[PDB]
Structure 1
Amino acid sequence: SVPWFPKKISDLDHCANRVLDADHPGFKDNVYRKRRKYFADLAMNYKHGDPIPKVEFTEEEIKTWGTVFQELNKLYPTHACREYLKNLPLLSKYCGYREDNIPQLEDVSNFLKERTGFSIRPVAGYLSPRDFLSGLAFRVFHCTQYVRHSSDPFYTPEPDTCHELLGHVPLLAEPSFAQFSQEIGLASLGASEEAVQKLATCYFFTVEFGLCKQDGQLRVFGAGLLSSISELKHALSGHAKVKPFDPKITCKQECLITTFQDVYFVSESFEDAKEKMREFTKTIK
């Protein structure tokens, strides 16, 4: 029968806590060790209704952010979709997006709440697909608060806060994107294991690695691209395989992690991607 799923936004307290390795940069770092523990604990003890704890980031952490931030910002005008470019300066103004400042999740959450009703919840680590997607049903983005190791600013084995803030947040501020995202979460609620994996894959090739066509040009809206200097350039380089976004086809595609994607999917628009998902979710309900 139907598995447990959240019925209200505070119900995410019951799944968001259901979560390093030696190959990771920073395994070797005792200070980074304690820091990550500190971030994980903040997420574990967060309960819905709490202000998200404000963090004093270290100078090393801010420098790492600045390095990623600076290089990525050179590429956004020519690579990011128009919605991304529209919202990014608003975040600069209202949430302190600067090369020399890491935005606080609480500010970003308040900004999004007034823009689309989206909000942030710090998450200690990787959640099951089901739990992660369930947050979106209440317009809750489960969001990492830690920073990648300073040794390698340009690669992270995992979503860190830099990826969340530069990759995800600007589009969550966009009504059409937020509707699309929430509908993925809503479709997942209490769905079968198979449906959840299918929805997770569609989410992956849209929210995380999606491309869209705007005024005849391919642009990027996927968060994983927008926080990855290499793959951002590669995705629009012309040497990449591209297919039309089509849920029944896209949900079969394998989600690669330790490498560039084999293929990227192109949505006509967020509205259209939304309409296709709606048609698709009917066949998996």
Structure 2
Amino acid sequence: QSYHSSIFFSISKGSDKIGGLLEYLEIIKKHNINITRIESRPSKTEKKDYDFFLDLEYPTENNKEVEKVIKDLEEKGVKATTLQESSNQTYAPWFPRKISDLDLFANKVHPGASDPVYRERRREIAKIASTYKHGDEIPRIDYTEEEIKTWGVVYNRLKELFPTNACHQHAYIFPLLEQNCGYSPDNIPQLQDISNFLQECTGWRIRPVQGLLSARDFLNGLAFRVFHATQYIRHPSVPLYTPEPDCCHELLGHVPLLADPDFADFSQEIGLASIGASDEDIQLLSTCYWFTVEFGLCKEGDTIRAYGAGILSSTGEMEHFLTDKAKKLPFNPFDACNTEYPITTFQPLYYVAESFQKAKEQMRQFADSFKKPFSIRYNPYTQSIEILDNK
């Protein structure tokens, strides 16, 4: 368990301070093992400045060595803005800056808990997410006959319901998943194939995840158009329901919508908003996420359909949302963000999105007043987060 800090500052080409600044940066890079990375880049704002980035990694929270580094740094003539992973508000929240920085989350994480066999199996699959690095191929799972049997039952069951209950984007993409990603009742699709297909449709990627991440970590991954997905399958004893995300939920629920460009933008938008957001704002985003990506409905003419991954992968949920006892409301993040919700029962309340581009715009407007030290932007050419000093 480690605590990350990042220090930002800018300086102009031809500055009198650069010489000593650079020299200082060399000494700490060599003789301070808490420093993991120091880099400089062209400024996104002042076309004549350089942006600098100093990444530190400590074993304990609010390590005061950071202040020591800040002081020695600002002594060379620059003003430093420091972000940190912490419960305190001494510094604004840290965020992963590159898609490869999501590697830092890899080790940050019941019907069959009363089953040792199933428990050892879960342990083995989770090992793979634990060791996976950005850039690697996603290792393929040799699923057992039992596991494949469970997939088949869920698959065939949900397949009977999609055409009448799923939003049209889902019906649109599913045959492409069949034709390109090996979707079938007889075969559990591998994440590496799904990730390649998603990349080529909307730039989204998958990485395996051990289990539940914190809301901040998971949402931050979305900012890079990276979806964290489990590889294990639910226990065979209870096939038609599970309280947790298993591969059926990931692959039949989340993945198809990620191949729709407008949905893909919307999801990333939620991710961007989370980058560097305060804990209270993360919680608002997480709830918005629940009522859209997880349990959202779309409007299609005089009809209401499901796009939420938690609905699409649950026969009981799909056979519930259309009943009159379940309340429906137009999606509005100001209304949804504060709404309580059950995790162990069907939803009593669903929010209806008009269109994904509208949901994207609504979220962006919602997030616009989030307090953050930097303006966060995504650059599709560099595939990275741009950080602007305009606040």
TM-score band (shorter)?
A: over 0.9
Using the TM superposition, give the Cα deviation of residue 238 of structure 1 relative to its aligned residue in structure 2, in angstroms.
Answer: 2.8
2:99 aligns with 9
Alpha-carbon distance in 1 for matches of 2:218, 2:209: 10
Instruction: Identify the match of residue 93 of structure 1 among 152, 176, 179.
Output: 179
1:11 alignment partner AA: D
2:169 aligns with 83
Using the TM superposition, give the Cα deviation of residue 216 of structure 1 relative to its aligned residue in structure 2, in angstroms.
Answer: 2.2
Query: Which has the greater radius of gyration?
Result: 2
Alpha-carbon distance in 2 for matches of 1:75, 1:98: 16
Instruction: Identify the match of residue 288 of structure 2 among 202, 226, 233.
Output: 202
Q: Secondary structure at the match of 2:201?
A: helix
The list of structure 1 runs, each at least 4 consecutive aligned residues, that deviate by more than 3 angstroms after superposition, is none
Gaps of at least 5 residues in structure 2 are 1-90, 372-391
1:5 alignment partner AA: F
Counting helix residues as a fraction of each chain, which structure ranks higher?
1
Instruction: Identify the match of residue 143 of structure 1 among 224, 229, 235.
Output: 229
Instruction: Identify the match of residue 18 of structure 1 among 91, 108, 115.
Output: 108
Whether 2:218 is the aligned partner of 1:132: answer yes
1:257 aligns with 343
**Contact 1:65/1:162 (CA < 8 Å) preserved in 2?**
yes
Show the 5 A alignment for 1:134-283: 134-283=220-369
1:198 alignment partner AA: L
Alpha-carbon distance in 2 for matches of 1:189, 1:272: 21
Length-normalised TM-score, structure 2:
0.71
RCO greater where, 1 or 2, for CA within 8 Å and sep 6 or more?
Answer: 1
| CA shift digits 1:21-70 (9 cap, x unpaired) | xxx11122222111100111010011111111101111100110000000
Q: Secondary structure at the match of 1:121?
A: strand
Using the TM superposition, give the Cα deviation of residue 17 of structure 1 relative to its aligned residue in structure 2, in angstroms.
Answer: 2.1
Query: Number of residues paired by the alignment?
Result: 281
1:104 aligns with 190
| CA shift digits 1:143-199 (9 cap, x unpaired) | 010000001101112000100000000000111000000010011001111111101
Counting strand residues as a fraction of each chain, which structure ranks higher?
2
| CA shift digits 1:217-253 (9 cap, x unpaired) | 1110000000000011101223311111110110001
2:283 alignment partner AA: Q
Alpha-carbon distance in 1 for matches of 2:284, 2:113: 33
1:119 aligns with 205
Alpha-carbon distance in 2 for matches of 1:55, 1:139: 23
Q: Secondary structure at the match of 2:92?
A: coil
Q: What is the percentage of aligned positions where both structures have the same residue? A: 62
Using the TM superposition, give the Cα deviation of residue 123 of structure 1 relative to its aligned residue in structure 2, in angstroms.
Answer: 0.6
Query: RMSD of the alignment, in Å?
Result: 0.9
Q: Secondary structure at the match of 1:266?
A: strand
